[PDB]
Amino acid sequence: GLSDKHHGLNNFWVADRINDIDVEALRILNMCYERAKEILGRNRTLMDEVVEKLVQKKSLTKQEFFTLVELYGSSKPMPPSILELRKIKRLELEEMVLKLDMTTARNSS
Amino acid sequence: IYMKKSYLYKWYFELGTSMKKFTILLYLLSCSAGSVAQDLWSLPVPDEKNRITSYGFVENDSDLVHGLLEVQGALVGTLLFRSEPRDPLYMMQDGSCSIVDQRFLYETSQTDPPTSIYKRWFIKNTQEKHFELLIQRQRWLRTNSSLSNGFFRSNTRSESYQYLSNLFISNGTLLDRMTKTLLKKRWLFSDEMKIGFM
Amino acid sequence: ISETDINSIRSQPNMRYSETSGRVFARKSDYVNSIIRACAPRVVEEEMFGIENLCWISAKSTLEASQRAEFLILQTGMTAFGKAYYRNQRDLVPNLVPKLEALRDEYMRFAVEKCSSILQEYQSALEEITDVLLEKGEIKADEIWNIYNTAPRIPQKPVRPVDEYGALIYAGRWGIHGVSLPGRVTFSPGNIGFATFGAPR
Amino acid sequence: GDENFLSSSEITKAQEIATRMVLQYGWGPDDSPAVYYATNAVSALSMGNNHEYEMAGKVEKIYDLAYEKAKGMLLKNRRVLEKITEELLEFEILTHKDLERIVHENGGIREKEPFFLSGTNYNEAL
Amino acid sequence: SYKVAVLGAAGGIGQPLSLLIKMSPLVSTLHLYDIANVKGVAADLSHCNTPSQVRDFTGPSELADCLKDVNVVVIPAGVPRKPGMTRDDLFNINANIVKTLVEAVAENCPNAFIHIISNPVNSTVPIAAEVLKKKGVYDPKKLFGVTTLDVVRANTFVSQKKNLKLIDVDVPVIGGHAGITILPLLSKTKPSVNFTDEEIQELTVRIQNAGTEVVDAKAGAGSATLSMAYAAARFVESSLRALDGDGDVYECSFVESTLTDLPFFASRVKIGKNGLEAVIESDLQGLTEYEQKALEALKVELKASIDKGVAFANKPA
Amino acid sequence: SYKVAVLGAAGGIGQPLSLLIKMSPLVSTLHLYDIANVKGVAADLSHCNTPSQVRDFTGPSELADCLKDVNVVVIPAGVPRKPGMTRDDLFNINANIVKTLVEAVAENCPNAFIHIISNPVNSTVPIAAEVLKKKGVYDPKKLFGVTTLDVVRANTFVSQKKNLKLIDVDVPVIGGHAGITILPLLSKTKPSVNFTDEEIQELTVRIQNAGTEVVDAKAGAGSATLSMAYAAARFVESSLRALDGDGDVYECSFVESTLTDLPFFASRVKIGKNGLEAVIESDLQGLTEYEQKALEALKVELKASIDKGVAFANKPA
Amino acid sequence: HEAGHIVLAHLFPRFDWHAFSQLLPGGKETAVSVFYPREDMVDQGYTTFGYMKMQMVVAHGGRCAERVVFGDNVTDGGKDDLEKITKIAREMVISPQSARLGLTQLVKKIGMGELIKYRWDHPHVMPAEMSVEVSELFTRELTRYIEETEELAMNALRANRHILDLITRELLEKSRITGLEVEEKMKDLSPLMFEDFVKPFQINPDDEELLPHKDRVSYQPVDLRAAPLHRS
């Protein structure tokens, strides 16, 4: 039900839609594989440093691994969480409803 | 005229080892003439008001006719003007069935969180009912879409009914005096049968 | 409505209603309204938070709406599907399957569009109720009704009404050729040539 | 009007042989080494949905080739077959020597090696 | 096992329509009627080895014998246009002929599927409705205007333009059957294909002027003959299919509809056992702006044509 | 995927036959031709929603463009009867037209199934054969005479008489296509039914004089049009099926046969990919004394007709 | 609803005996009517087409009367009846004596009370393998029978409305009646009587005469397939 093809709807009757259900899984798999490939190609230097440390030490803790991530990482823009989206949508809703308020008031007054 | 208180299909088939292909036609003709007589001798034009649906031997006659038609159409591979359409997947099924018969005779979201990313997020046997339902629906759609052998048997029975009607029209007096004899005398044996054939 | 709380986690909302026995009658509009109200949690999260923030328990809402649409189509006889009563398991002939699929798709499209149009209009009352529930953790029917009656309203475009025959026009045995019938003259099977437009020979 | 139910068991055996030597042994009409079934298997491979029709077409092709070959080699000795029927009917006991006599005097045209069901793909050993 | 009676089966359109009805596996009796030269068509048809029977009637006095127990009445009667004759006299002649025929049908068989082909159908169907109303037996559910020709032309033009399968392409057409009163709903064409602006304009003008193209290509030889016979045979066979209980018979026709303010309109309808069963209103929902202004432009002329029709249909005798 | 070229597609026969050929599922290109009034027929047919394409040509100068790559050539051209016309003038006009058309076919495309329809076909098929012989390209296996209307009429009359299943009724007809030449093999009618002597005589004379009955039923309005178009479309579809490799195409036709002493005869034949494949001789074996004496009665006049045809076809220019 | 059921039950020449009808039985928001089948039908051992048409018209009755009285905004009070009719209609199509679907292999046996026994619901009866064309004919038979008996019930209920209002008043006042009260209330009002559907077809035993036949079997072969499409 997390798919957005029609609206969730993981059940159908005719053969065409049941056949098309499995195609979306392949499309999501390919999109995720391409995203993983792009992310992996972005961090080849961090790749090399951490793999050398892994063959040299056979075990890595949080501190040193995150230190190497900080030294050799790229930009990782975190998507906004629920709270920021709620706040921007709330301010947008308030501003458009007050826009409706003047477009009613000065048109009426 | 008195009611009675079932498995004639198997006796004829086991008693027949090397029977003719023409006696199947006679068996089909004899198993479908009572409906012809009932449709004939009942007066026409009600809205089917006087039909006798769902009683004893009509279902048995229909089952016997269907079985004889299946036997005749599965054994085709002159007598018959045409043959069955022969759906082009029947030979694979027969070959696989023979192979298997010979082989037989020759003997909920994982509420415990993962501490490692190697572990999965949902259990493998969580969504098995939905997969089975989709598979069964797809199999039903595939199986109930390729019956090209449902119109040959209908026309075969149609010609059988037409011939039976054309034959019973000429001998209408025979069935008339015969059903009257069954009406007065409550039992009817073969001797009275042959006497009333006059 | 009686009360509303946000303190417990459940698959269904924590709403409470005042039961009144005596449901002798229920018209088709009640079924349509039930189908509409069934698919509420998905639309609000797709509107405010988008499709990439749907929860697992908030995405299993349109399934219930589709099941109620199936119940309305198959076991009420008030739609254009016919006036028969079908128990789902085996007395569903393959001819009726595309009709059922098209009718359910049309009903679910109407329900989703109506939900979006309703939830976009009353967004001010929606956020006021959300803020009150966040501050207090418990709201009652009187405050909900006061917020509903005092909040401003946003004009919205009219929705496309649900029609059953307009989804059943392209649901047939032949499919799409038969709404567009070319017609042909045949002489091959038998001895008689026939000019046919969709009708069997 | 005189049809036979006696030869049905040979027809079913022929249908079984065709599907065996198309699927199991890889002796298809195009000599494909693909194998879809094994001696210990309980079922076949996936075989898709649009690929079973190709396998059925190959099995029908080899079955028709076998029937055509048998018909061709049996319509050339019709008088031989009639004489064998008459002699079996009048004597009720037949040896190999009288059958050799029949296929000799009646002009019985025997076949010759190599025996292939389709000579379009036959090769020879080294 | 259904009966079709054609009134005017000895004209230009009548003979091919009668021949195609003879080939239909649904018709069992065909009643040709015309004031003259109707026995030759019956003699031509009777030699074909089709199970349907053809009988002919000559003169109005046999018209009462023409319409007994007739299940589908087809009216293609009407003299085609002659040189030097304006719209008024041809309109009067065709309207008088169709008025007499509808009077005969109302007296003999009110409960027959009435298919009007005589041109113009925008000002003829109201005349038939008014005549049927005067006898107190009018049934709006069993009176159709055969406008399948526009649908066939639209499908052919779309298939020739965008190169689709001609078997699958269907184009809904609303409005009328004359001039700019024809509105092809090209945005709802199945299968779904998106057009450009100039392509939409070209297809619209080609569909609207196909009639003048086909009557000027003949160089004054008359109107089209085979195409309306094709469309009338298609509509008759569709009506006969709907009469057998088939539950998916949807056809485009000009009937008394309540979709717009107009009393009569051409739209997609669903035909049942008892005549008209449903009128599809979703054909008027979701229209683009171009189709909207085309509809509002064609509404005035459609109203004028219907007004002229009902004005003639109530003239004193 | 086959092309049919109709020579004379704007006459009485030309339009219904073209309409039937257009919406048959075998033709994909239809090259109509007539000396005049062929543009309107093409415009009428081009509006139908059938995938087969129609093109038209005007005048003999476009004849070289009409017959290119054509698989089946059908020649129904010929002026119908006018009052005051004897057999001499009509025969001369029709034979000159068919001579010019067969000359054009031989020059442009001689590998096409040639279907001769013009009347009388007893004296026209020899003319076409002689014209094809003069160019050194004559193929007797690809020249047919469409005489299946006699078979259709025989089936119709037998079914009307004996009340038999019309989907099963077929009657062999031998001889020719004009009058007493028609010998319906009523004793070989399938399925098996037995006739009386009076019934046999009545059916024979009805089948032989059905042409005159349908001509004089029109009261001088022409010959059979719809049933002839029916027979022509049936033979066209059968020949197109023979071109597709169908192995059970048995049709009754008037071809150059060796069954009798006559060079040309009408019998049952089996048509293949390369034209004529077999001629069924068993139609002449097992005849009763009535059919035998009718055959020997019609043989002399059929010989006279063929001799007249080949005598005209070798007239000096 | 129950007044319509009672009116259509007592509008037939030979129906089941109406023992009593009671409004609101034991506090439940419903009603119950009791009909006892006649002894001859129980002693027969088989059912006719007229009898199942009889019962399915009666089952249409309550909803049809509710729609006639309260308008076209019909409720879901009669859903069970809308089920029963369907099953009943199926029993007229599954039977081999059907004029249109008789000579065609319907639901098959996998290999192995009440006055009307449903062959569709047997544990050893599975649905047959059917094409897309003949199953629509099955649905067409179903819809045709259902609409025929619905039209019959509607005509019956719109025929006598005064009796319907009287009986509605009787249940509204007394909340329970018997068959005798309705029968004496059917007596002096002159309703529009139906024809007899369960009249038996019988033969004169000793009357020497040749009873006629039409001249045919009424069965038609099921053969419906479209013509091959274009461009081939």
Swiss-Prot record, chain A:
Required for plastid development during embryogenesis. Might be involved in chaperone functions or play a structural role in the thylakoid FtsH complex. It comes from the Eukaryota. The chain holds residues 768 to 876 of 876 of the full protein. The gene is FTSHI2. Disruption phenotype: Embryo defective. Homooligomer. Interacts with FtsHi4. It is found in: Plastid, Chloroplast membrane. It comes from Arabidopsis thaliana (Mouse-ear cress). In the N-terminal section; belongs to the AAA ATPase family. This is Probable inactive ATP-dependent zinc metalloprotease FTSHI 2, chloroplastic.
UniProtKB/Swiss-Prot annotation, chain B:
It is found in: Plastid, Chloroplast stroma. Probable ATPase of unknown function. Its presence in a non-photosynthetic plant (Epifagus virginiana) and experiments in tobacco indicate that it has an essential function which is probably not related to photosynthesis. Coiled coil: none annotated. Belongs to the Ycf2 family. This is Protein Ycf2. It comes from the Eukaryota. It comes from Arabidopsis thaliana (Mouse-ear cress). The gene is ycf2-A.
UniProtKB/Swiss-Prot annotation, chains E, F:
GO terms for molecular function: chloroplast protein-transporting ATPase activity; L-malate dehydrogenase (NAD+) activity. Expressed in rosette leaves. Expressed in meristematic regions of roots and shoots, cotyledons, young leaves, trichomes, stamen, pollen, tapetum, gynoecium and ovules. NAD(+) binds at residues 8-14, 34, 94, 117-119, 228. It catalyses: (S)-malate + NAD(+) = oxaloacetate + NADH + H(+). One of its GO terms (cellular component) is cytosol. Disruption phenotype: Embryonic lethality when homozygous due to embryo development arrest at globular stage. Keywords: Chloroplast, NAD, Oxidoreductase, Plastid, Transit peptide, Tricarboxylic acid cycle. The active site is at residue 177. One of its GO terms (biological process) is embryo development ending in seed dormancy. The keyword Transit peptide applies. The keyword Oxidoreductase applies. Its EC number is 1.1.1.37. Its main location: plastid. Substrate binds at residues 81, 87, 119, 153. It is found in: Plastid, Chloroplast stroma. Catalyzes a reversible NAD-dependent dehydrogenase reaction involved in central metabolism and redox homeostasis between organelle compartments. Plays a key role in the metabolism of dark chloroplasts and non-green plastids. Essential for embryo viability. Plays an essential role in heterotrophic metabolism in embryos, and autotrophic metabolism in photosynthetic tissues as well. Belongs to the LDH/MDH superfamily. MDH type 1 family. Homodimer. This is Malate dehydrogenase, chloroplastic. It comes from Arabidopsis thaliana (Mouse-ear cress). The chain holds residues 82 to 398 of 403 of the full protein.
From Swiss-Prot, chain G:
Disulfide bonds: none annotated. It comes from the Eukaryota. It is found in: Plastid, Chloroplast thylakoid membrane. Induction: By high light. Signal peptide: none annotated. Zn(2+) binds at residues 1, 5, 81. The active site is at residue 2. In the N-terminal section; belongs to the AAA ATPase family. Probable ATP-dependent zinc metallopeptidase. This is ATP-dependent zinc metalloprotease FTSH 12, chloroplastic.
